[PDB]
Write a protein that holds these residues in place. Structure first.
Motif, PDB file in Angstrom:
ATOM      1  N   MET A   1       0.829  -1.200   0.000  1.00  0.00           N
ATOM      2  CA  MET A   1       0.000   0.000   0.000  1.00  0.00           C
ATOM      3  C   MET A   1       0.867   1.255   0.000  1.00  0.00           C
ATOM      4  O   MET A   1       1.751   1.402   0.846  1.00  0.00           O
ATOM      5  N   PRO A   2       0.618   2.164  -0.945  1.00  0.00           N
ATOM      6  CA  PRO A   2       1.457   3.366  -1.060  1.00  0.00           C
ATOM      7  C   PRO A   2       1.022   4.446  -0.079  1.00  0.00           C
ATOM      8  O   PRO A   2      -0.156   4.801  -0.012  1.00  0.00           O
ATOM      9  N   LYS A   3       1.985   4.979   0.672  1.00  0.00           N
ATOM     10  CA  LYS A   3       1.680   6.000   1.667  1.00  0.00           C
ATOM     11  C   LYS A   3       1.709   7.392   1.036  1.00  0.00           C
ATOM     12  O   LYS A   3       2.570   7.675   0.199  1.00  0.00           O
ATOM     13  N   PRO A   4       0.776   8.274   1.409  1.00  0.00           N
ATOM     14  CA  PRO A   4       0.816   9.663   0.921  1.00  0.00           C
ATOM     15  C   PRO A   4       1.892  10.442   1.663  1.00  0.00           C
ATOM     16  O   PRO A   4       1.843  10.569   2.887  1.00  0.00           O
ATOM     17  N   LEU A   5       2.862  10.964   0.922  1.00  0.00           N
ATOM     18  CA  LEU A   5       3.995  11.664   1.509  1.00  0.00           C
ATOM     19  C   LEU A   5       3.908  13.154   1.208  1.00  0.00           C
ATOM     20  O   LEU A   5       3.524  13.555   0.106  1.00  0.00           O
ATOM     21  N   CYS A   6       4.264  13.968   2.201  1.00  0.00           N
ATOM     22  CA  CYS A   6       4.267  15.415   2.055  1.00  0.00           C
ATOM     23  C   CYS A   6       5.330  16.005   2.969  1.00  0.00           C
ATOM     24  O   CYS A   6       5.462  15.594   4.125  1.00  0.00           O
ATOM     25  N   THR A   7       6.085  16.966   2.441  1.00  0.00           N
ATOM     26  CA  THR A   7       7.105  17.665   3.206  1.00  0.00           C
ATOM     27  C   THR A   7       7.105  19.134   2.805  1.00  0.00           C
ATOM     28  O   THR A   7       6.720  19.488   1.688  1.00  0.00           O
ATOM     29  N   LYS A   8       7.537  19.986   3.731  1.00  0.00           N
ATOM     30  CA  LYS A   8       7.553  21.424   3.501  1.00  0.00           C
ATOM     31  C   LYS A   8       8.910  21.850   2.956  1.00  0.00           C
ATOM     32  O   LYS A   8       9.952  21.481   3.508  1.00  0.00           O
ATOM     33  N   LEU A   9       8.892  22.627   1.879  1.00  0.00           N
ATOM     34  CA  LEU A   9      10.097  23.165   1.278  1.00  0.00           C
ATOM     35  C   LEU A   9      10.319  24.591   1.779  1.00  0.00           C
ATOM     36  O   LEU A   9       9.721  25.029   2.766  1.00  0.00           O
ATOM     37  N   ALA A  10      11.184  25.327   1.093  1.00  0.00           N
ATOM     38  CA  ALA A  10      11.440  26.719   1.422  1.00  0.00           C
ATOM     39  C   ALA A  10      10.436  27.628   0.717  1.00  0.00           C
ATOM     40  O   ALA A  10       9.822  27.257  -0.287  1.00  0.00           O
ATOM     41  N   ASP A  11      10.274  28.832   1.270  1.00  0.00           N
ATOM     42  CA  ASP A  11       9.415  29.868   0.688  1.00  0.00           C
ATOM     43  C   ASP A  11       7.963  29.404   0.586  1.00  0.00           C
ATOM     44  O   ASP A  11       7.276  29.664  -0.404  1.00  0.00           O
ATOM     45  N   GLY A  12       7.491  28.716   1.622  1.00  0.00           N
ATOM     46  CA  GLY A  12       6.111  28.272   1.663  1.00  0.00           C
ATOM     47  C   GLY A  12       5.725  27.277   0.593  1.00  0.00           C
ATOM     48  O   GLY A  12       4.580  27.288   0.132  1.00  0.00           O
TER      49      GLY A  12
ATOM     50  N   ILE B   1       9.987  11.156   2.763  1.00  0.00           N
ATOM     51  CA  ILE B   1      10.554  12.355   2.159  1.00  0.00           C
ATOM     52  C   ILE B   1      10.687  13.423   3.234  1.00  0.00           C
ATOM     53  O   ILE B   1      10.013  13.393   4.265  1.00  0.00           O
ATOM     54  N   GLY B   2      11.574  14.377   2.975  1.00  0.00           N
ATOM     55  CA  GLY B   2      11.791  15.471   3.901  1.00  0.00           C
ATOM     56  C   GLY B   2      12.596  16.565   3.238  1.00  0.00           C
ATOM     57  O   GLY B   2      12.944  16.487   2.057  1.00  0.00           O
ATOM     58  N   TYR B   3      12.892  17.597   4.022  1.00  0.00           N
ATOM     59  CA  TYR B   3      13.619  18.755   3.525  1.00  0.00           C
ATOM     60  C   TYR B   3      14.632  19.203   4.565  1.00  0.00           C
ATOM     61  O   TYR B   3      14.294  19.355   5.743  1.00  0.00           O
ATOM     62  N   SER B   4      15.874  19.395   4.128  1.00  0.00           N
ATOM     63  CA  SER B   4      16.928  19.985   4.952  1.00  0.00           C
ATOM     64  C   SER B   4      17.616  21.024   4.074  1.00  0.00           C
ATOM     65  O   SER B   4      18.362  20.664   3.158  1.00  0.00           O
ATOM     66  N   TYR B   5      17.346  22.303   4.354  1.00  0.00           N
ATOM     67  CA  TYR B   5      17.763  23.456   3.559  1.00  0.00           C
ATOM     68  C   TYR B   5      19.175  23.289   3.011  1.00  0.00           C
ATOM     69  O   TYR B   5      20.122  23.078   3.780  1.00  0.00           O
TER      70      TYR B   5
ATOM     71  N   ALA C   1      15.027  11.911   0.230  1.00  0.00           N
ATOM     72  CA  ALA C   1      14.138  10.783  -0.020  1.00  0.00           C
ATOM     73  C   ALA C   1      14.729   9.532   0.608  1.00  0.00           C
ATOM     74  O   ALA C   1      15.877   9.175   0.327  1.00  0.00           O
ATOM     75  N   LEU C   2      13.940   8.864   1.449  1.00  0.00           N
ATOM     76  CA  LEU C   2      14.370   7.650   2.134  1.00  0.00           C
ATOM     77  C   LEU C   2      13.770   6.446   1.417  1.00  0.00           C
ATOM     78  O   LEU C   2      12.548   6.278   1.384  1.00  0.00           O
TER      79      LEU C   2
ATOM     80  N   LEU D   1      19.602   6.787   1.106  1.00  0.00           N
ATOM     81  CA  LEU D   1      19.018   8.113   1.239  1.00  0.00           C
ATOM     82  C   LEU D   1      19.456   8.962   0.056  1.00  0.00           C
ATOM     83  O   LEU D   1      20.656   9.080  -0.215  1.00  0.00           O
ATOM     84  N   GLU D   2      18.489   9.543  -0.646  1.00  0.00           N
ATOM     85  CA  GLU D   2      18.756  10.371  -1.814  1.00  0.00           C
ATOM     86  C   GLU D   2      18.693  11.841  -1.425  1.00  0.00           C
ATOM     87  O   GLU D   2      17.743  12.274  -0.767  1.00  0.00           O
ATOM     88  N   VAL D   3      19.704  12.602  -1.830  1.00  0.00           N
ATOM     89  CA  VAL D   3      19.730  14.047  -1.649  1.00  0.00           C
ATOM     90  C   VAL D   3      19.569  14.666  -3.028  1.00  0.00           C
ATOM     91  O   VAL D   3      20.455  14.536  -3.882  1.00  0.00           O
TER      92      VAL D   3
END
Length: 345
Positions: free
Chosen positions: A194-205, A239-243, A248-249, A257-259
């Protein structure tokens, strides 16, 4: 292509240790590890880690998720399929369980500076949002004081992911798709492009949505952006964001881990983390946890990153990375950028 982050293990369980890691929480000097046995370990990050205090029987079952609100000095825990509020320093329960949190899937926490409409004075407002079946429960702290009223929004499908877009809007992910919830007005909007819905916050909203291998870019209001889909071979586990990079895991069997670049979408780095199953985020790095190891990701200084890209001939990538970064993070962003552009021509 680039050494954006360096991986060093700070916490290691032993292979035959009966305990496994389920979630961690890093605040300042400390890392809080929740285990499958219900115990809660506290580690001091030296400069690897020292075990300060183990709280066995903190929760009669596994600790699924941890968060804190620093204003109220409160630790939020997801265990016994409910949500509990503990004191961050004595770990005595404030409210365990939290009312109406029974059979909760997860929670999401944010805390921001908002101005009072009448007086215009900056006030710290805190939001804790818990997913219980198709219901979304909202607690709020005003100046570290929990409000007596709990807001509830009922959706059409069960919530599977929750990511705060801003101080007042929350992106919720179900099977059918994503929606935007205004916690102040209780209004729901469908997100369209089952595919999970992924969401992460980027820069500048900005926010990045991912379901299976499909991706979408939106803003804090939830309106689609004209961008290409991220071209990764397999769907990411997380997924995630590090400025200023997207992370991506991949599934634990691959252990990578993909950068990637939020601009060019190119694969900047690949890190081999065996067993890695979750990411943990708050110009300082993040953490990656397996069932036995907690690695701390240390970001290389951006000047060396751009120099490495230039030495490799990846000029367009260096220009994109330089454009993304703030000027205070580089020795001289302006002249370095003009130099790289003159190397291109």
């Amino acid at each position: 292509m680039l050494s954006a982050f360096t991986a060093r293990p700070i916490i290691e369980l032993k292979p035959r240790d009966k305990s496994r890691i389920e979630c961690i929480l890093a605040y300042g000097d400390r890392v809080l590890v929740g285990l499958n046995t219900g115990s809660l370990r506290v580690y001091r990050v030296n400069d690897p880690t020292d075990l300060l205090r183990e709280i066995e029987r903190f929760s009669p079952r596994a600790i699924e998720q941890l968060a804190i609100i620093k204003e109220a000095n409160t630790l939020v825990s997801l265990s016994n399929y409910c949500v509990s509020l503990h004191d961050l320093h004595t770990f005595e329960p404030i409210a365990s369980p939290l009312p109406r949190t029974k059979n909760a899937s997860g929670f999401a926490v944010t805390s921001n500076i908002v101005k009072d409409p009448a007086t215009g004075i900056p006030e710290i407002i805190s939001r804790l949002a818990v997913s219980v079946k198709r219901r979304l429960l909202l607690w709020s702290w005003h100046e570290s004081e929990l409000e007596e009223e709990v807001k509830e929004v009922v959706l059409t499908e069960s919530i599977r992911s929750m990511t705060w877009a801003c101080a007042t809007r929350l992106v919720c992910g179900m099977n059918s798709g994503f929606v935007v919830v205004d916690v102040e007005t209780g209004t729901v909007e469908d997100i369209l492009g089952m595919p999970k819905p992924l969401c992460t916050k980027l820069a500048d909203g900005q926010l990045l949505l991912a379901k299976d291998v499909n991706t979408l870019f939106i803003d804090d209001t939830g309106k689609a952006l004209e961008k290409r889909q991220i071209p990764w071979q397999a769907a990411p586990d997380g997924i995630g964001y590090s400025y200023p990079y997207i992370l991506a895991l991949q599934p634990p069997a691959k252990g990578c881990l993909e950068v990637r670049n939020p601009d060019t979408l190119s694969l900047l780095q690949t890190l081999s983390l065996p067993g890695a199953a979750a990411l943990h985020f708050p110009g300082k790095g993040f953490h990656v946890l397996s069932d036995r190891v907690v690695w701390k990701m240390d970001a290389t200084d951006y000047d060396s990153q751009v120099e490495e890209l230039v030495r490799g001939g990846k000029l367009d990538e260096a220009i994109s990375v330089l454009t993304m970064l703030e000027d205070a993070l580089l020795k001289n962003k302006t002249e370095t950028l003009r130099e790289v552009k003159m190397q291109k021509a």
